[model samples]
Target: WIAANTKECPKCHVTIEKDGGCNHMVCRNQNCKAEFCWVCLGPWEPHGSAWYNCNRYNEF
Candidate 1:
């Protein structure tokens, strides 16, 4: 199941692997630091505006 759900970074569409933990993911695309959750595949938001953050950071 883990292998199937794991997908490429949404920003760059480059393959990535979720090795447990928080499931928060950051795109390897250095130019495009698209942060998101690997578990829910939701966009990572920081502060009030639409920014980038890990899954844990999004809650705060």
Candidate 2:
């Protein structure tokens, strides 16, 4: 019920339905193609400007 719900565009600023598991999110916009972590809405690279704080939620 947590991660299975939905996420932000991370680029398009739209609502996106997550198909399955995992917090790694790729923007729905083909032109944008922004990569981010749905859990923290941070860039996939390093998951954001920080790591430790941004990584906890991804774990059980």
Candidate 3:
């Protein structure tokens, strides 16, 4: 079963949902909409009109 939970963003300290699927996630706060993988903590960036992966996940 997929479990849902909330975790604080390390950068902005905003509550983020930990849902199963793509690890890619972004902050809800407009000013602090930073993207980072919830599982690998990999940095991500929003390009033109899409979110692009910046790094790979190493084993947690």
lDDT scores in order: 0.40, 0.43, 0.42
Tens digits of per-residue lDDT for model 1, 1-60: 011233455655545454433334453344335554333454323222333332323232
Candidate 2 residue 17 Cα shift, in angstroms, is 1.9
Q: Which stretches of candidate 3 lie over 4 Å from their true place?
A: 1-6, 18-23, 26-31, 34-39, 42-60
Rank all candidate structures by their lDDT, best first, as comma-separated numbers. 2, 3, 1
Candidate 3: worst-modelled 10 consecutive residues by lDDT: 42-51
- What is the alpha-carbon RMSD of candidate 2 to the true structure? 9.6
- Model 2 bad stretches (over 4 Å): 1-7, 20-31, 34-60
Q: Which candidate number would show the highest lDDT if scored against the true structure?
A: 2
Candidate 2's residue-wise lDDT over 1-60, tens digit each?
Answer: 122223455455655455433334444345335554444454243344344444415554
State model 2's lDDT. 0.43
RMSD of 1: 10.6
Candidate 3 — which pairs collide?
Answer: none
RMSD of 3: 11.4
